Ligand binder design. Sequence first.
Ligand SMILES: Nc1ncnc2c1ncn2[C@H]1C[C@H](O)[C@@H](COP(=O)(O)OP(=O)(O)OP(=O)(O)O)O1
Ligand SMILES: [Ca+2]
Ligand SMILES: [Ca+2]
Ligand SMILES: [Ca+2]
Ligand SMILES: [Ca+2]
Ligand SMILES: [Ca+2]
Ligand SMILES: [Ca+2]
Ligand SMILES: [Ca+2]
Length: 902
Amino acid sequence: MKEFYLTVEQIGDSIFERYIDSNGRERTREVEYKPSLFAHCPESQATKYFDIYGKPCTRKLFANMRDASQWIKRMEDIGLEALGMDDFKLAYLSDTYNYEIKYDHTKIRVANFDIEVTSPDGFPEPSQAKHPIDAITHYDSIDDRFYVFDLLNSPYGNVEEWSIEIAAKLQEQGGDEVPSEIIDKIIYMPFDNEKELLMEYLNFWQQKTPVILTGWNVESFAIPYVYNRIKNIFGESTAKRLSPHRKTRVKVIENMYGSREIITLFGISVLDYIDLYKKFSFTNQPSYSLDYISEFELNVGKLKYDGPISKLRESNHQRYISYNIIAVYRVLQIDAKRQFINLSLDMGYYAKIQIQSVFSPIKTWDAIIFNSLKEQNKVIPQGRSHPVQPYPGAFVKEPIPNRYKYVMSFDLTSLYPSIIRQVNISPETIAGTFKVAPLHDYINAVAERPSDVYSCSPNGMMYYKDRDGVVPTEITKVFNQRKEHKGYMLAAQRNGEIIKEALHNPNLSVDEPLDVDYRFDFSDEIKEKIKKLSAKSLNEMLFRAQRTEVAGMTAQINRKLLINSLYGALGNVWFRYYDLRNATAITTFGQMALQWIERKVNEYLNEVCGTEGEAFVLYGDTDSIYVSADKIIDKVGESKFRDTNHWVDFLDKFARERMEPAIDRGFREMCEYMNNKQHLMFMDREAIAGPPLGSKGIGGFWTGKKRYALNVWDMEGTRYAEPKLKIMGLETQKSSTPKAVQKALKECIRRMLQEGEESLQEYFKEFEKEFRQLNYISIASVSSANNIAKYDVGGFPGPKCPFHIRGILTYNRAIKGNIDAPQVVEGEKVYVLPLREGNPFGDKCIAWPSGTEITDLIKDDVLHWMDYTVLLEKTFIKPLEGFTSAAKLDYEKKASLFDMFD
DNA sequence: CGTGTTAGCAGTCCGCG
DNA sequence: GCGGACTGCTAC
Ligand SMILES: Nc1ncnc2c1ncn2[C@H]1C[C@H](O)[C@@H](COP(=O)(O)OP(=O)(O)OP(=O)(O)O)O1
Ligand SMILES: [Ca+2]
Ligand SMILES: [Ca+2]
Ligand SMILES: [Ca+2]
Ligand SMILES: [Ca+2]
Ligand SMILES: [Ca+2]
Ligand SMILES: [Ca+2]
Ligand SMILES: [Ca+2]
């Protein structure tokens, strides 16, 4: 097999590299790497090296890496460009793996771990590590084994060994319900004392050194705790055995009260799953505890126990250890679903970077572009310093706030990357400028045609047509992967609906789920078999279709993020290829395109509907337009339609056969106008929206920019079995809105769009009546606790103190001296509740760490002093009034002359 | 060491015979 | 007590 790297580090003049060899064995080598950098030279000098603008360069081959670095300094002091890859480990990788890396994950040691630390004096701070590590579960991807390190004797208690037999037993038998499929994978190691546990752990670590190290919060707790604990017991050099190159870097963060650390372990690529989740999941969660995320991702129940965690080991060691093991498995289960490790590996090897650099789009792109240019013997420019300047972005139309009965939306595919490719926007393809007319003038095609010769953006930039730029070239490759995965995703989505439709009439028989690939549309034969399957088999098939869809989603949306991140990088001062002309060329072209196509759609629809001068396009944002289809429906008359699906079919046909070709013509013309390199403005029908036929449903509404709701029947070729609500920007979509309120506001919206005012009024009355019976956590607001200290004036609110911060401060006063009441962590999320006047807390609100029950010592009082009235008004009523006034609808029956009657 | 801009709502502070 | 300027937080 072809070789591939595992990790790479620069330490002084040495590259330290862990890799897999031709036989597939792990190896480590140290290399005194001899880097090259480049300087411009005279044209009269014959060379094979050119900068990206075609200017000749000369190679400087250096004796070592410090010399190369010191040369860059001397060049800076002289005032001349020092060209080439200045991050030497990227160059090393590029030299060593001068081919498309084909890697084998089965050879990569992925470690997943978590530790327990009993602490009677509050949170066990990793910087201090003053408490014993009394449990470690470490899963190894190569052994496929959970290695359990269990401390039996501690200052905080001596316990008996943990029982695997009892762990496997159901909770109802008094066991821990450790999932049966990992029971056989556990290797259990008890210890009489901490020192020998840790010694064994280190020696185990040396045998099975992680390449990828993951888990939940390992970066902020587990890794620094282990490191510091081993340091305090055996000394720093022993703690340094955690690095395969015996090298660590310790950096301390301080603010006012608490002190924290993150430890860099050289030769390991740490990918904290919480970080992967936050970057790649496209959620925003009210809490980031593992219990919460596992429940959200896996529908697994919360790992409940009696008493505080500080006493769980002594009171129930059996469960303590079992929960350590389960918490580690849960991360593996989440990754089995979301596949972020797979994505990080794909991305990392594709770019040729340290795997941990997938968190940096800038490092990723710099690496991709460098490798692309190196292949052509081209030399990359030196990074330069730039002041941060603002620049203009996308166009968002101001909608008339109203209900909108029938809506069809249209969307441009992967817009900004498409603009990059259409216009041929790159650092080295800039041809020159033209004098700009006002934007309105291009939108309306009255402005003089920018160029007969070059490809143009309405920001005034001109580009070469007859040569590809590195940026369009490289963005196209990733765009094309993204398209492949999205196709698989939509196919699995469509397959999902075929199953949901078949679950309407399940068959009374015992069979099994069909062996199929959900990434492709079910054939007619498969569809015929599905109609005859049992509910049990269909539901297993639906589960698999949905797992296939999530997998295709992870893969497509994060490739999308990466390419869009190349657009943004052009507007980041740290990017080697930072250029506000290129960034603005993209955004201004986008503004033109959206508004150009608005006019063309309005023109076309007035033509075919035989009217003149009316606004069919009701909204637009960046790359998408929303068309009122009322007059399309009215042109034929509703009476002609048999059912909902009928008119949906009608609009589907209308959009695809009539509108899209008009849109295509429209953009073809715009491309000619800007004299662009390749037409890539592909605007296709997105959603079809309306109320059920014959209902009193209103179909949809806008309240303002970025705030709207639609009852959608078809989305990107997916015909839903049941209508799905597409809600954007409204409180139902916000993580700060209480869970139960999201649920109630969504049902309010469902009723408005599908059923009508009267149905809405029925629900509202019911929810107002039962509001005060809801669980306090379900009705708490949520927020991030940033800059707590900045508003902390003797434990009281300082000037302009935010509501949620006031709540935290109130909490801090109430838990003063509680010793082991959970502290609010800076930057983390809290639940928030308003308090009635005269409460024992001495303020109008309280806040506590989210995903948790508020501590028992103050819980009673919180429940007693909650202001439900304020809570209802602020979280539910005020937003609902916003929705209903926009839709010209009432949530409460208004008074009228009829009230005089019985 | 480090993708981007556009945009609404909640809250504090301030003015307000 | 309701607006306007301001911070803080949260669809493309
Ligand atoms: N995370 C982001 N970073 C930078 N720019 C973004 C981001 N999200 C969106 N944009 C900009 C660039 C996008 O091309 C444009 C439109 O975004 P979006 O509506 O998500 O669809 P898209 O056209 O990029 O892709 P799709 O093919 O999924 O429709 O807005
Ligand atoms: Ca734990
Ligand atoms: Ca789009
Ligand atoms: Ca689309
Ligand atoms: Ca059937
Ligand atoms: Ca869009
Ligand atoms: Ca089309
Ligand atoms: Ca109390």
